[PDB]
Amino acid sequence: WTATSGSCKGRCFELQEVGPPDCRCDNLCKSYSSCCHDFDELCLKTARGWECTKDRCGEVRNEENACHCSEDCLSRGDCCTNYQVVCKGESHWVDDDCEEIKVPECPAGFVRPPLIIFSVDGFRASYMKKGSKVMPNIEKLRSCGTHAPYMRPVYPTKTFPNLYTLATGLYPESHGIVGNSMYDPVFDASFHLRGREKFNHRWWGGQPLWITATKQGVRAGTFFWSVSIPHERRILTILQWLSLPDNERPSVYAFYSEQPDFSGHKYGPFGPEMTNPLREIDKTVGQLMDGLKQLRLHRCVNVIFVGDHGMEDVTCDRTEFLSNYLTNVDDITLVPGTLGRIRAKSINNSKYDPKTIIAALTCKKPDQHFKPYMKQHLPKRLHYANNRRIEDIHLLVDRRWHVARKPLDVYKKCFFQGDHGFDNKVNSMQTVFVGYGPTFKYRTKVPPFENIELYNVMCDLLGLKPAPNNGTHGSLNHLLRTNTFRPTMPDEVSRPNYPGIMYLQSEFDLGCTCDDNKLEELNKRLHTKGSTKERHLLYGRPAVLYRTSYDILYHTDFESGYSEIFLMPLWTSYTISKQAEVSSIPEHLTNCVRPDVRVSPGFSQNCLAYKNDKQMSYGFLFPPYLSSSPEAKYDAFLVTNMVPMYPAFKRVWAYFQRVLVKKYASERNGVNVISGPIFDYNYDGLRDTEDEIKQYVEGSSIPVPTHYYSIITSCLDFTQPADKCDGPLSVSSFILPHRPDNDESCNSSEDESKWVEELMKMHTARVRDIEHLTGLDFYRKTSRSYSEILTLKTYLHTYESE
Ligand SMILES: *[C@@H]1O[C@H](CO)[C@@H](O[C@@H]2O[C@H](CO)[C@@H](O[C@@H]3O[C@H](CO[C@H]4O[C@H](CO)[C@@H](O)[C@H](O[C@H]5O[C@H](CO)[C@@H](O)[C@H](O)[C@@H]5O[C@H]5O[C@H](CO)[C@@H](O)[C@H](O)[C@@H]5O)[C@@H]4O)[C@@H](O)[C@H](O[C@H]4O[C@H](CO)[C@@H](O)[C@H](O)[C@@H]4O[C@H]4O[C@H](CO)[C@@H](O)[C@H](O)[C@@H]4O)[C@@H]3O)[C@H](O)[C@H]2NC(C)=O)[C@H](O)[C@H]1NC(C)=O
Ligand SMILES: Cn1c(COc2ccc(C#N)cc2NC(=O)C(C)(C)C)n[nH]c1=O
Ligand SMILES: [Ca+2]
Ligand SMILES: [Cl-]
Ligand code: NA
Ligand code: NA
Ligand SMILES: [Zn+2]
Numbered sequence: 001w002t003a004t005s006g007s008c009k010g011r012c013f014e015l016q017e018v019g020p021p022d023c024r025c026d027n028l029c030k031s032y033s034s035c036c037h038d039f040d041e042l043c044l045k046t047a048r049g050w051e052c053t054k055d056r057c058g059e060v061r062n063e064e065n066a067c068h069c070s071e072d073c074l075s076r077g078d079c080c081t082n083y084q085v086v087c088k089g090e091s092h093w094v095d096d097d098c099e100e101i102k103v104p105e106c107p108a109g110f111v112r113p114p115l116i117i118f119s120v121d122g123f124r125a126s127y128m129k130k131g132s133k134v135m136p137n138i139e140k141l142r143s144c145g146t147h148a149p150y151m152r153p154v155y156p157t158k159t160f161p162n163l164y165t166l167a168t169g170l171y172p173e174s175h176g177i178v179g180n181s182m183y184d185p186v187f188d189a190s191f192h193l194r195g196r197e198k199f200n201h202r203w204w205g206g207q208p209l210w211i212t213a214t215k216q217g218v219r220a221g222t223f224f225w226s227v228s229i230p231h232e233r234r235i236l237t238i239l240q241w242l243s244l245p246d247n248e249r250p251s252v253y254a255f256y257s258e259q260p261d262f263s264g265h266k267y268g269p270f271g272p273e274m275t276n277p278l279r280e281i282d283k284t285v286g287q288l289m290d291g292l293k294q295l296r297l298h299r300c301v302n303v304i305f306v307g308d309h310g311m312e313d314v315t316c317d318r319t320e321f322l323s324n325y326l327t328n329v330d331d332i333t334l335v336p337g338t339l340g341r342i343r344a345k346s347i348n349n350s351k352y353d354p355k356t357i358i359a360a361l362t363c364k365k366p367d368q369h370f371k372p373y374m375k376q377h378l379p380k381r382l383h384y385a386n387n388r389r390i391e392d393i394h395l396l397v398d399r400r401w402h403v404a405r406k407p408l409d410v411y412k413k414c415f416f417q418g419d420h421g422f423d424n425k426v427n428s429m430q431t432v433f434v435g436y437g438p439t440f441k442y443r444t445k446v447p448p449f450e451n452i453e454l455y456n457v458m459c460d461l462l463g464l465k466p467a468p469n470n471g472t473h474g475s476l477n478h479l480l481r482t483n484t485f486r487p488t489m490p491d492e493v494s495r496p497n498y499p500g501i502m503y504l505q506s507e508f509d510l511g512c513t514c515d516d517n518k519l520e521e522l523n524k525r526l527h528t529k530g531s532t533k534e535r536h537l538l539y540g541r542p543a544v545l546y547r548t549s550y551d552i553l554y555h556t557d558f559e560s561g562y563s564e565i566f567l568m569p570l571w572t573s574y575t576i577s578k579q580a581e582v583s584s585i586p587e588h589l590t591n592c593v594r595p596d597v598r599v600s601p602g603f604s605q606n607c608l609a610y611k612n613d614k615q616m617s618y619g620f621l622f623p624p625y626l627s628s629s630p631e632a633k634y635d636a637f638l639v640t641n642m643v644p645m646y647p648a649f650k651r652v653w654a655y656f657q658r659v660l661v662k663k664y665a666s667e668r669n670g671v672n673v674i675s676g677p678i679f680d681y682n683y684d685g686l687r688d689t690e691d692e693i694k695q696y697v698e699g700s701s702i703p704v705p706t707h708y709y710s711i712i713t714s715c716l717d718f719t720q721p722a723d724k725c726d727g728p729l730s731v732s733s734f735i736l737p738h739r740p741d742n743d744e745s746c747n748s749s750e751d752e753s754k755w756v757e758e759l760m761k762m763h764t765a766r767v768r769d770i771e772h773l774t775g776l777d778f779y780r781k782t783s784r785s786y787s788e789i790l791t792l793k794t795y796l797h798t799y800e801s802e
Contacts, residue, residue: 004036010035012043013237013248015221025029031079031199037787050232050287052080057087063391067236074294077243081235081291083269093298094137098144102481104438106300109246115461116238117254117304118288119166120281121159122261122420123308124269125150126431127278134275135282137289138434144443145436146179146479152450153309154794155382156421157429159185159261160193160450162308163504167208167223169455169469173390176205180421181187181335182389183343207467209458213252216464221253229727231257239291248408248786251460255288257281261420263313268417269428280593301774302439306454307431312399314338316414320369320799321532325361329405332357338421339402340370340395354393358424361395365745369401376683377744379763380707380735380773381796382424383470385683413702425798439483446479449794460485472768475790487786489621490777492543496552496561507599511608514592516634524631530554533725537573538672539713540781544570545686551638556632558622560641564603565690567702568643571676571776572621575723576665582658585624588638596640605702613698619645621675623657643677646698646740652759653708653736655752660760668714668730670722677705678735678773687775709770711778728784732797735765735773767793 001021017026023036025043047064048056068079070088083092088260104113125758127149132139154165154172158180161172172178182191182203191198210220221241225234238253259277267273273785285305292298294425323329331352335341344352354374361372373394375385385395386391397403399422404410422429430448439461456473459466460483466473474487477667536557544550549564558574611616627633635641645653664671679688681695695704711733715725736759742748767778771793779789 002032006033006036008036008039008042012313012744013222013240015219015241018365027222027224027226027229030228031560034738044229044233049081052083052086054086062334066232077240077295078236079294081239081287081294082624084294085290090293092286093293094140094286096245098140098699100442100486101299104300104396105296107296110300112251112463113248113302113461114242114299115249115252115304115458116251116288117166117306117458118285119163119254120257120258120305120307120432122264122309122311122418123281123307123432124260124264124428125307125308127260128432130270131275131278134279135379137282138305138442140287141303141436142434143445145303145434146440146444146446147434148446149431149450150448151307151433152448153424153429153431153449155384155424157309157424157426158421159308164204164206164208165244166306166451166454168206169452169466169471170206171452171470172207173383173387174470176203176387176389178384178387178389179335179339179341182554184389186388186719187371206469212459212464212467213462218252218462218464219248219250221250223254223256225256227258229399231255231280235284235291238288239295240293242292242557249354251457255284257284261311263286264418265416266418268313269692271417291622298540299438302435302437302534304454304458305432305434305436306451307433310429310431310521311418311420312422312426312428313417314400314402314419315417316402316410318369319404321404321407322361325364325408326357327360329351332405334403334405335391335404336404336409338397338419340397341391341396342393343391357393362743368746369398370395370403371744373744374659376706377737377739380680380685380769381765383685386685388389396423399423399428421504425796428798435582439481440479441481444479446476447791447795448588449476449791450796453794469735472790472794474787475794477787478791482766487790488667489780489786490545493546493776494544494548494550496541496550497546499553501550503595503596503597503600505595505597507742508595508604509594510595510601510606510638510639511605511611512593513549514594514637515588516592516594524556527556528554530559531554536575536672538723539779541573542571542674542776542778543780544775545777546775551599554597555622557626557628557635559640560621562599562640564599566677567603569621569676569775572641573672573674574622574626575670576626576661577670577721577723578665580626580628580662582625583627583633583664586630586633589624589633592632592637593636593639593642599640599682601784605642605697606639606700609700609702610644615646616644616704617647617650618642618696619650619653623661625658626661643708644702646738648741649708649736649738651742651748651752652756653677655756656710656760659753660757664712664714665722668712668722669718669720670714672713672722673710674778675708675710676774678707678709678770679703680706680773681777685769685772687773701763705738707737707773709733709734709765711767711776713772726783728788729779729782729792731767731792731795733765734760734763734768735769736760736763761799764797764799766796 003021004023006023011025011364024034029035045066059070061070068078153162161177168175212218263277331343331345332400333343358372375394453471453476456471457476477484551562553560553562558567560572563570610696624636650752681692693703714722714733715729716728743760745755
């Protein structure tokens with residue numbers, strides 16, 4: 001109950017919210033049906049429209065008007081945005097040449113340049129080129145400021161998850177807004193776009209920018225605008241707040257537009273009806289810039305023009321129905337659309353089985369337009385598993401398609417021609433970023449980057465210390481003229497041991513067998529001391545950022561950091577030049593495993609456990625196929641280069657090592673490779689401690705990895721070989737799930753040349769993703785600046801076309 005009979009007189013768009021049942025005058029009041037009786041009359045004036053005209057110039061103030069053209073309007077901060085143009089012979093901001101903004105040019109009393117976040121719903125990255133003729137104000141921001149060709153959203157590519165990721169720097173799994181619709185089993189409550197539950201504070205985790213600002217004494221304007229408050233009034237309100245006295249004036253502001261998303265749903269991303277919404281958005285930007293100019297703030301404010309996600313062509317006939325796959329369809333609840341999430345309709349049903357549901361949805365029709373996953377098997381790059389609000393069963397839906405439970409759900413609930421929500425690598429889901437102002441660079445294009453990075457930068461722009469988040473602070477320093485954040489490399493926690501020859505062959509009882517000169521002996525000793533290490537370890541050894549016990553092992557063809565706790569390498573590093581040759585494993589060495597006389601039997605794996613374990617086989621991290629000489633090849637069969645592998649996974653790994661590494665070396669002019677195991681049994685994206693491992697090679701203490709990574713680095717200028725590169729680097733990486741079957745790949749009964757590389761592309765990763773998962777820190781010794789290295793570590797190779 002609200003006693004909605006107070007008044008909004010003097011209080012219009014009040015920045016502090018009043019405690020009910022006192023009536024409200026803020027933007028949220030509409031959403032609560034709690035506005036004072038006179039809110040519309042006083043706060044939403046519309047009389048005479050939105051622009052000054054010739055005959056309105058110098059008028060006598062009439063407080064009923066939507067905006068003013070009187071002489072005193074500037075001092076009041078309530079002129080229509082085109083006032084100076086029409087009445088004082090000024091030019092529109094868009095018609096002025098751009099001029100570098102080298103320093104902030106602000107009115108006296110401004111302690112820092114204000115930040116304005118101009119957020120646009122459904123604004124697809126390609127609209128910047130394709131709509132350029134009809135968006136002159138936006139094209140001026142873009143060409144005169146700092147811009148990316150596109151910005152990567154988070155998964156799922158829905159509105160609330162992405163906007164709250166912008167605000168917090170967090171993945172949806174950590175902030176808690178994991179979809180547009182959600183069930184939380186602990187609260188036993190549901191969250192929906194329509195309705196009241198979404199206003200409850202318990203849904204919203206992390207610390208958004210407006211709270212970060214307030215806690216540190218920086219004032220914030222509203223981030224939320226009621227849908228019925230027209231766009232012209234939102235702009236005028238911001239311009240009014242910027243006229244407040246120094247002690248009352250916010251330093252950060254947000255504008256939001258429901259377009260072009262609203263129209264894109266109805267007409268598709270490029271429908272002829274889409275031109276008008278893009279024109280209208282551009283006119284709004286023009287109004288802000290004209291308004292800032294009148295206030296002498298157009299060379300003072302930093303403006304961010306940013307989208308939440310793009311928009312794809314999707315129609316009703318492109319729907320798959322779970323009723324075409326499942327017999328028990330009424331015993332499940334589906335969260336439907338451009339992704340799928342499945343749980344049991346009733347917790348009292350103990351005959352519901354997720355295994356048989358997954359199997360009934362796996363590779364059943366020749367062109368099936370979704371793929372089922374247990375959430376922990378989703379590509380790690382999506383970071384979409386560590387939340388109780390994310391159902392165990394997930395469906396990744398092909399772009400252009402929907403999934404629904406039964407046909408009745410579609411025709412009893414074609415309307416739409418566009419939708420979004422798909423995998424965040426998809427080109428149609430990419431969105432926009434432009435920064436313009438004294439703190440951003442002038443006429444600068446930067447590479448594409450992820451929206452999780454922006455919170456840190458908005459904190460930098462406002463002099464705030466960011467709350468802990470998933471950005472990599474410093475990776476976006478190249479966007480900025482000043483206010484850069486100067487990070488230091490993390491300190492190494494554990495130093496390695498460097499073991500020499502300490503054990504005789506006969507001390508090993510591992511059940512392993514193998515069929516195995518003064519010039520050529522001084523040679524082998526130097527290799528084991530690290531003589532070729534400069535060739536195989538190009539960027540320094542990785543630093544271990546947790547407490548553990550490990551050894552560095554040198555060899556002719558590779559170097560490794562070998563964990564005495566996990567009984568295998570944490571990392572193995574090797575360089576393959578363009579000229580390198582592939583050989584095979586000779587017949588007499590097919591099942592050869594050799595004890596490592598630098599490492600105790602007690603800290604070694606054993607062959608008998610693999611013989612005993614009927615499900616589990618083994619592979620090698622440095623591939624024997626790529627040995628430099630028949631004698632160097634013996635090093636590759638050391639028990640210290642061995643790792644546990646399911647036979648189904650060995651098909652993948654063997655093709656990567658035998659075919660793909662040489663292919664990359666030919667195409668990239670040499671590559672440096674770092675490979676290793678990952679253990680993430682609790683699917684939190686972070687390295688497991690040893691007490692978290694759920695599976696071992698039968699009857700041993702050899703832990704089974706959940707994934708295998710590789711990081712593949714070369715020269716960005718590919719006329720220079722990987723091992724002699726003078727400038728910036730180029731990287732691609734992956735995190736392959738270590739699975740006992742290939743059910744994920746529907747063509748896997750075919751030759752590896754038809755499906756393996758496609759699997760690897762799906763599981764593409766950032767170096768930073770691997771760092772979180774292993775507790776290692778890479779690229780410690782290069783000739784490059786640390787900020788440049790941080791940008792490299794956040795890079796994702798997506799394999800999408802242009
Ligand atoms: C992306 O960036 C984020 C942010 O940096 C990273 O997430 C952090 O990860 C930290 C390490 O896992 C984690 O630290 C833990 O914090 C626990 C206290 O958490 C509360 O306080 C914080 C700070 O204010 C708050 O943010 C948290 O909010 C979470 O929980 C509520 C829901 O209840 C949500 O509203 C909110 O959205 C958020 O949820 C997310 O995080 C939780 C985990 O915290 C997930 O479960 C959710 O799914 C969701 O993803 C909390 O309100 C603290 O209790 C922990 O301490 C335990 O572990 C330590 C190890 O050091 C041990 O020594 C202690 O004994 C203790 O263990 C005890 O509890 C165990 C479990 O009950 C029990 O088994 C033991 O026996 C012990 O009794 C721990 O320090 C931090 O909370 C989050 N922060 C956020 C915002 O998510 C994230 O890792 C990054 N991702 C990647 C891939 O890099
Ligand atoms: C969506 N929306 C808005 C604008 O909301 C925003 C604009 C910019 C940022 C940032 N950074 C964040 C939000 N919102 C959020 O983060 C939510 C998820 C709490 C709503 N007004 N009206 C309306 O429907
Ligand atoms: Ca983990
Ligand atoms: Cl959703
Ligand atoms: Na076996
Ligand atoms: Na298969
Ligand atoms: Zn939408």
